[PDB]
Design a protein around this ligand. Structure first.
Ligand SMILES: Cc1cc(C)nc(SCC(=O)Nc2ncc(Cc3cccc(OCc4cn(Cc5ccc(OCCN6CCOCC6)cc5)nn4)c3)s2)n1
Ligand SMILES: [Zn+2]
Length: 292
């Protein structure tokens, strides 16, 4: 097996061997909760309680493309309510920036729409946004599709003006994937290529319960180590394949580190000799963002 032991220490030794060249990060809402962004897919989300005042036909309508296109106002009111107070990536985000800097990051697949990976410096081709992103928006008319930056969309959101295209006056929609919309072809193109190449899967802040993330860890080669950094264990197959095997007698490649993603990334960085680099980077970038 590739790991000499099923611990964070074994993963760190593997990462600094010649065998570990290409790391894929799979990240979810748990890497942004310390940035103050709540997980609306969580079983305990307060979202639906807070949706009551929009008198929706049913709560899930907030996520549905057909409802959006006929009644966009609840979505844009909610977007104002939930707009992040700061755009300050976490220790975990900057750990991924170090992976990029050091030439180890093949790809970051993210469930998050908050753009924090981009603020931390991951570039477009580094990222696969499994549920889309607020980073860009597009006019919804097929013959127009004018693109708008987040600054434009933010101004419309905060002024409570439903965003309309300047060229054709159709609705302008953030590039997040509503229910009823398809994943872009790029998700499948990347998945089909990346998981032939991956030497290490870093799974952070995701329960792997929602598609398409629920399909991803089975795509890795059988030998590829998989490290979960999460408040709780996740990814084991339901008792009723390629699911996580942390604890059986046959476990050989999967490691669970249980805690906040920031703490787990700090601990891994420390084992790698990167703790000073990560602390200096985060303190500098956070001070600068607090200044904005
Ligand atoms: C830069 C920036 C700016 C803003 C404004 N915000 C943020 S970030 C802050 C945040 O949230 N802003 C939001 N703005 C709008 C929101 C609503 C919304 C509508 C449509 C798509 C959305 O996104 C993509 C998406 C869609 N799906 C599918 C899905 C899957 C599982 C789900 O479970 C429902 C919850 N149930 C689960 C079990 O039963 C109990 C609870 C729900 C949806 N997944 N992703 C988002 S959310 N950043
Ligand atoms: Zn247009």
């Amino acid at each position: 097996r590739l790991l000499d032991e099923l611990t964070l220490e074994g993963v760190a030794r593997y990462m600094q061997s010649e065998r570990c060249r290409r790391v894929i990060c799979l990240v979810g809402a748990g890497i942004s909760t310390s940035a103050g962004i709540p997980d609306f897919r969580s079983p305990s989300t307060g979202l639906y309680d807070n949706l009551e005042k929009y008198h929706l036909p049913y709560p899930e309508a907030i996520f549905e493309i057909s409802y959006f296109k006929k009644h966009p106002e609840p979505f844009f009111a909610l977007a104002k309510e939930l707009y992040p107070g700061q755009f300050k990536p976490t220790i975990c985000h900057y750990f991924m920036r170090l992976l990029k800097d050091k030439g180890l990051l093949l790809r970051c697949y993210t469930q998050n729409i908050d753009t924090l990976e981009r603020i931390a410096g991951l570039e477009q081709e580094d990222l696969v946004e499994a549920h889309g992103t607020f980073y860009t928006s597009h006019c919804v008319s097929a013959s127009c599709r004018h693109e708008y930056p987040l600054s434009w969309m933010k101004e419309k959101i905060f002024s409570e003006v439903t965003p309309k295209c300047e060229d054709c006056q159709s609705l302008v929609k953030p590039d997040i994937v509503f229910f009823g919309e398809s994943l872009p072809a790029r998700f499948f193109s990347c998945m089909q290529s990346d998981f032939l190449k991956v030497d290490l899967l870093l799974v952070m802040g995701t329960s792997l319960q929602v598609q398409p993330f629920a399909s991803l860890i089975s795509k890795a080669p059988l030998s590829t180590p998989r490290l979960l950094i999460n408040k709780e264990k996740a990814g084991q197959s339901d008792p009723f394949g390629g699911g996580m095997d942390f604890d059986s007698k046959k476990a050989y490649r999967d490691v669970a580190w249980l805690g906040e993603c920031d703490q787990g990334c700090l601990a891994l960085a420390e084992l790698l000799g990167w703790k000073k680099e990560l602390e200096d980077l985060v303190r500098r970038e956070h001070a600068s963002i607090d200044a904005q």
